[PDB]
Structure formats: C-alpha cells, structure tokens
Amino acid sequence: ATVLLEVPFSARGDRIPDAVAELRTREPIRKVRTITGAEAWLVSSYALCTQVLEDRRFSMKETAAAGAPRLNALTVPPEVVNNMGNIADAGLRKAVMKAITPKAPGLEQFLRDTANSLLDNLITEGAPADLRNDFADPLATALHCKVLGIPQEDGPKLFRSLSIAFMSSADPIPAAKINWDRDIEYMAGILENPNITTGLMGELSRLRKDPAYSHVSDELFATIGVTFFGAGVISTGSFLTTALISLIQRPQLRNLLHEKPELIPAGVEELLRINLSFADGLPRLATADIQVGDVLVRKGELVLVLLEGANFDPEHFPNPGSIELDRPNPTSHLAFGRGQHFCPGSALGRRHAQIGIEALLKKMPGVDLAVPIDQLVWRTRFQRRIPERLPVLW
Ligand code: HEM
Ligand SMILES: O=C(O)c1coc2c1C(=O)CCC2
C-alpha cells in the first residue's frame, strides 16, 4: 500500500518533475494531500487550470474560512486574504494600479542605474558573485522602495521579514505575526510622515485625508503598503533569480539576447512561461458543486491550480520546455494568473526582469554558474522556489 500523492512534488526551480506531464496526460485533475494533511484537487492541464481561474465560484477569499481544507497555514490575518477585494471595495483599485505601473517618469532610469551600480560593485569585488542576494533581491527591494515612496534605507529591514512571511507551513508561524505587526506599524507611521509624498504610500497618504475616503480604515491603508511591498519584492526577486538560471543554462539564447537586446521582452515573456517560481498550486475553495474534467468538485473542497502544469502543456505550447521567441500565443501563459485575481503588478514585474537582464548581459556578457547546478540549495516549505545563493563568475 502507499499513501495518497503529496504536494508539492519538488522544491527545485531548475527542472520540472516527470510526474507533472504524467498527471497532465492521465489525470489532469486528481486528488492529492497537502502539507497540512488536507485533501485537495490538483489541476495540471492548461484547459482545466484556466477553467478554475476564470470561474469565481472557485473562490480565493473562501480559502481563509475557519474549518476549510488548507494548502498551508495563514501568515496574515484572514481578512487580508481578500486584500484586493478590500482595496476594490474601498474605491482604491485604480489608484493602486496607477501607482505601481513601470511608466512613472524616471522609474525605468532609476532601475537601470540601480542594476548597473549593483553589477559594478560585484565586478569590483571579483568573482564569485551571488546574483540572488547581491543583485536580484536588492534590485527588487530598491524598486519597491521607489514605487512605494519610502526611504531606500528602510528596504533591507522590510525585506528581512519575507523569508518567514512567504513561508508555506503546515502550522501557524509565531515570527510571521511579530514581523507583520511591526511592518504594519511602520506603514502606519509612513502614512503620518509628512516627508512621504511620492509613490503608492504618498498617494494613499493623500487619499486618506480626502473626504471621499474618510471611512476607509487606517488598517487597510497600512495593509496595502505591507502586502504590495512583500508580494512585489518576493515575486520579482524570485522570478528574476530563477530566470537568470534559465538563461545561464541556455548559452545560445543568452548570446542571442546579448547581441540583439530588442528581443529581451520576448525572451522575458518565455522565461515567465517556463518559470517555476511558484512553489504550490494557486488555492481556491469551491463555493458550489462544479464539474472539472472527469471530477465533480464539491462545495467546500480545495482546488490547487498548478501554474507549470498549464505553462508546460504541449497542447497549448508545443515544445513546452524550449524557449522560442516567435510563438503566436506568447502572453497566454499563466505566470501572472488569470481572471479575477490576475496579478496587479504584472507590468512592473516584466519591466524589473527586462531591465535586470539587459543590464546583466551588457556588464557580464560571459556570466556563467560558478558551481555545478546541482549544488544550488533550494529553499523548502516556502511559497516560492529559490536558490539560497546563486554563485556566478564571468
Ligand atoms: C514576475 C513577478 C510576479 C509574478 C510572477 C507574480 C505572480 C502572481 C500570480 C500568479 C498571482 C495570482 C495569485 C492568484 O490568483 O491566487 C499574483 C497576484 C498578486 N500579485 Fe503578483 N507577481 C509578480 C509581481 C508582482 C508585483 C511587482 C506586485 C506588486 C508590486 C504584485 C502583487 C500581487 C498582488 C497584490 C496579488 C493578489 C491579487 C488578487 O488577489 O487579486 N505581484 N501575482
Ligand atoms: O503579505 C504577506 O505577508 C503575505 C505573505 O503570504 C501571503 C501574504 C498575503 O498578503 C496574501 C496571502 C499570502
């Protein structure tokens, strides 16, 4: 006898396990056990992943209900799981989205200048360099301080909460509450700080004093700062890191992009498609009995949408493991989700990766791993897949 198949299958972000294509072909929705001991339905084909993400009866908000089957323990208060819904209910969706676009004057030049300064510091120090801790994560942190309007020097202490805040744990995490409460106090101070007049926190601080928002709560204003810093920094730093691995392991493509940087946006869209940064399927709770493939999912059951199941589906992306810059459907991957909860930071995340890669290819055209790939240490029990260090030479 064996126990029911457990998820996740592997914390490695440099290879997709053979189980995924096997499930997708044989059982594109099938029952699994999560780290809490709950059962769930794992969806692994592009068709069924899009069906679930486009049907709001598979609810994000209801995953926070007491008693529900859980993917992992909450690391924020339950009402924060409905963060974007709360932002939309407060009439703040358009304002938040405007503040986090990469189109703000000078923002791209600030990202380029920051990437070039970090790279020059590594070149001065000499190989090996760690492109996660001393390049992709400080570039994500500096970008998000600039986008929020908060001091660059406050980035590193907010960042250090993230290796706990974005854990994927079977049990509640006492340090996540200590850091959450501290980071909320900091964002509440930022709203009262007269020096903060730009970016998303300067805009929320002005709307807070406008009569059209006088009953929006101070807890929501501070929550938007902590959640958008943390989601944006963990997601862009982790995606850039694992995209640099995929590029370093494809020297022919790396040389193509170095030679013709105008192809970097199409290369980044393929590195999104093949990215294994999300460590778990996206969770949803059924609010009705709904047929998905050969399974009748029942109200109250947990469904997990495996993004790499969709993104490596050869029925939708033929030769799925290959980066091909001339696909006819290049932005139809699920790396930013789909439907009601599609990522609000998608443009910013694409621009962070494009500028980081352009800068790295110009400054370190011979970049390569400095250790054998199997020596990278993959973080476990985390909502992203990331190597703890990414040692390179050039
Ligand atoms: C390459 C970088 C990024 C990737 C791959 C990414 C991926 C995703 C995915 C897959 C979702 C959907 C989750 C779901 O449906 O359950 C999502 C939602 C979210 N993302 Fe991103 N993200 C990125 C960058 C950003 C940035 C830069 C921000 C903010 C500055 C951001 C903030 C959020 C928020 C707040 C949500 C929740 C939306 C909702 O619930 O409606 N992300 N992201
Ligand atoms: O912002 C966090 O610290 C956070 C860390 O983990 C999550 C969040 C969310 O706000 C969304 C639910 C998952």
UniProtKB/Swiss-Prot annotation:
Pfam families, per the entry: p450
One GO CC annotation: cytoplasm
Residues of the site described as Participates in a stacking interactions with the tyrosyl of cYY: F166, W180
Cofactor: heme
Record field: catalytic activity: cyclo(L-tyrosyl-L-tyrosyl) + 2 reduced [2Fe-2S]-[ferredoxin] + O2 + 2 H(+) = mycoclysin + 2 oxidized [2Fe-2S]-[ferredoxin] + 2 H2O
Family matches, as PROSITE patterns: CYTOCHROME_P450
Main localization category: cytoplasm
Swiss-Prot/TrEMBL site (Important for the position of heme) positions: P344
Binding site for substrate: T75, N83, M84, S235, K299, Q383
Disulfide-bonded cysteines: none
Residues bound to heme: R284, H341, C343
Enzyme class: oxidoreductase
Protein location: Cytoplasm
Highest taxon, organism lineage: Bacteria
Job description of the protein: Catalyzes C-C bond formation between the carbons ortho to the phenolic hydroxyl of cyclo(L-tyr-L-tyr) (cYY) producing mycocyclosin. Can also use cyclo(L-Tyr-L-Phe) (cYF), cyclo(L-Tyr-L-Trp) (cYW) and cyclo(L-Tyr-L-3,4-dihydroxyphenylalanine) (cY-DOPA) as substrate.
Family: Belongs to the cytochrome P450 family.
Name of the protein this chain belongs to: Mycocyclosin synthase
Species whose genome carries this gene: Mycobacterium tuberculosis (strain CDC 1551 / Oshkosh)
